[PDB]
C-alpha cells in the first residue's frame, strides 16, 4: 500500500503553527483600494492620476 506517492512533500517541521498566517481579507482590501483611489481621483480637480509609462 501507499503506492500513491513515494514521499510526503510537506515540510512543516519548523513549527508551522507558530509561523502561520490566515488570509481572507481580499474583497475588503479591494474596497479600501477603491476608496483611496476615488478620494485621490476626486481631490486632484478630476485631473488624471494615471501617468504614461
Partner RNA sequence: UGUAGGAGACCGAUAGCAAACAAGUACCGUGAGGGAAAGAUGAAAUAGUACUCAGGAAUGAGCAAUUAAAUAGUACCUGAAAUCGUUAAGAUGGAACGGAUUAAGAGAGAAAACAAGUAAAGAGGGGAAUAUUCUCUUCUUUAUUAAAAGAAACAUCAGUGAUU
Partner RNA sequence: UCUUAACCCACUCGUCUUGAAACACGGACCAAGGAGUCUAGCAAAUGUGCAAGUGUAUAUGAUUCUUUAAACAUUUUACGCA
Partner RNA sequence: GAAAAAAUUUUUUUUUAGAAUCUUUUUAUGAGUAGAAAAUCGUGGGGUUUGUGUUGAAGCGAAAUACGUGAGUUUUCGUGGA
> Which residue number, 5 or 47, has a Cβ lying nearer to another protein?
5
Burial of 52 (0-12, 13-18, 19+ CB in 10 A): exposed
Pick what 6 binds: RNA, another protein, none; C-beta below 5 to 8 Å, kind-dependent. Answer: another protein
Among 1, 4, 19, 21, binds RNA (CB under 7 A): 4
> Which residues sit at the interface with RNA, rule CB under 7 A?
4-5, 8-10, 26-31, 33-34, 37
Amino acid at each position: 500500500v501507499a503506492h500513491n506517492n513515494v514521499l510526503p512533500n510537506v515540510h512543516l517541521h519548523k513549527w508551522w503553527q507558530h509561523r502561520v498566517r490566515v488570509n481572507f481579507s481580499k474583497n475588503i482590501k479591494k474596497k479600501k483600494r477603491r476608496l483611496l483611489r476615488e478620494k485621490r481621483r476626486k481631490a486632484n480637480g478630476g485631473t488624471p492620476i494615471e501617468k504614461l509609462h
